[PDB]
Design a protein around this ligand. Structure first.
Ligand SMILES: CC(=O)N[C@H]1[C@H]([C@H](O)[C@H](O)CO)O[C@@](O)(C(=O)O)C[C@@H]1O
Ligand SMILES: CC(=O)N[C@H]1[C@H]([C@H](O)[C@H](O)CO)O[C@@](O)(C(=O)O)C[C@@H]1O
Ligand SMILES: CC(=O)N[C@H]1[C@H]([C@H](O)[C@H](O)CO)O[C@@](O)(C(=O)O)C[C@@H]1O
Lengths: 178, 178, 178
């Protein structure tokens, strides 16, 4: 079964301003593993067009945080509202889609950190060009005031000069809680 | 269920000359997502051995296009004939394997382009060496005179000097039409 | 169904010294393809902390070899004992998890080599930093005195200076024997 966003271009996400972006996320449960497919289009706000070269105050990284309550429902501090993830019909409780707590343990301590296995790195590309890389860093169960979390960190090193944040797709998997 | 090529080394593909290559492609339907595994061996023609260094007329990129009719059957202009994709037995209509039209919309207009989410980038390696990279660029639903398409673009920047096009394997996923 | 290690941090692997490492490996059968998720934590021995900069005798690569008998059970020369892979309960014979012999043929001859499609390359990161890359090279069916094999080769080029071998996660797939 599948927990997913809509697939259209309509925004569902706040990075900078309300509804400035569309995170397209498809989570497919394949037994003990979630098969995940993600893309990001930014449609408004300061990250729509990366102007790092002409705006030194613009960040070169941002997060999209899916903070889940114990039930597997999004919490308000997430970048996406809980209504924007639904089950796909005959092809709540979403604990079967949550990142496994034994594989991806929370930091033990204020002064401890997670194991690196809680993280996946990938490279995605802006405006469909191989010379516009962005590092996508996906971390499990590393957020305060949440039962489970999936955090998508987007970061880049190039002083991009009017490049639209229209990202290529990325596939990954993670171990499911149950 | 699975839509796949044969797994042997026998050629099934024309890049340059007839039957000059074997695209090994395994598509596994996992609900709403296709889990895809691809490799390429070039056995004849001008791309069998990359001689860019001693032949400046040789391209540094080529496409393998799977152009599908509405039924999910290959069209003649594809690099592979329709007979070379089959269902795996008790483990036509292949619309369940086709790239989703809402997620991967065609270009609206002669002067418009697709969203970047229609594309996946990866790096694969020739002759099993990490110093022989090739960019594999997979694009959905971006081809003229086709209902659906999967295009594999292979490109490289090194002036390769007698390197066999014997590629490492690559895994990806995409959202299914139905 | 799933063939997996435990998910805790407890070591299950010998790279240098007994039980010096935890390979977390989850293999999910999705019809004709195995969906695979791997991470590595080194907890003891010479690779726990990479000190290449101050120990020129330390290798910059090592293997973790899963050598399978015909039944799909680990052989003693593997880096992991056979007890450390088990089936996940109602969600031996593990031939359904073995790398396909037609897709991933053994070398024909003492002087022959495998096709490159028997290999996957990826990049993973140590201590959750994008400036600590390691090349993960996964090769199928390329080991002496084994029916099937999955070999994880880890290699790096940086003279790492006291970097813990605490790896990020990596997803891949391969074609199943049956
Ligand atoms: C798809 C890909 O690998 N992109 C990479 C390109 C490659 O050089 C390609 O080969 C170009 O075609 O190089 C970079 O340095 C760049 O351009 O910023 C890093 C980027 O991640
Ligand atoms: C597997 C891998 O990442 N290959 C990359 C290597 C790395 O440096 C490795 O670390 C070598 O072992 O570097 C390149 O510049 C190269 O050699 O052409 C790009 C290539 O994509
Ligand atoms: C995640 C990632 O791609 N890491 C790569 C970084 C990128 O430059 C990032 O952009 C840094 O944030 O560069 C390397 O040369 C490095 O630092 O050793 C290779 C490494 O594989």
């Amino acid at each position: 079964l599948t927990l997913w966003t809509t697939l259209d271009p309509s925004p569902n996400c706040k990075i900078d301003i309300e509804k400035d972006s569309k995170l397209t996320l498809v989570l497919t449960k394949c037994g003990s593993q979630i098969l995940a497919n993600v893309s990001l289009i930014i449609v408004n706000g300061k990250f729509k067009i990366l102007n790092n070269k002409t705006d030194p105050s613009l960040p070169k990284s941002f997060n999209i945080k899916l903070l889940f309550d114990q039930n597997g429902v999004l919490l308000e501090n997430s970048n996406i509202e809980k209504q924007y993830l639904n089950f796909r019909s005959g092809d709540k409780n979403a604990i079967g889609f949550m990142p496994n707590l034994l594989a991806y343990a929370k930091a033990t301590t204020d002064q401890s950190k997670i194991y690196a296995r809680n993280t996946i790195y990938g490279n995605i590309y802006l405006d469909n060009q191989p010379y516009n890389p962005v590092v996508i860093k996906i971390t499990f169960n590393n957020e305060a005031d949440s039962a489970y979390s999936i955090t998508f960190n987007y970061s880049w090193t190039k002083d991009y000069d009017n490049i639209p944040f229209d990202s290529t797709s990325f596939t990954f998997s993670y171990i499911a809680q149950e």
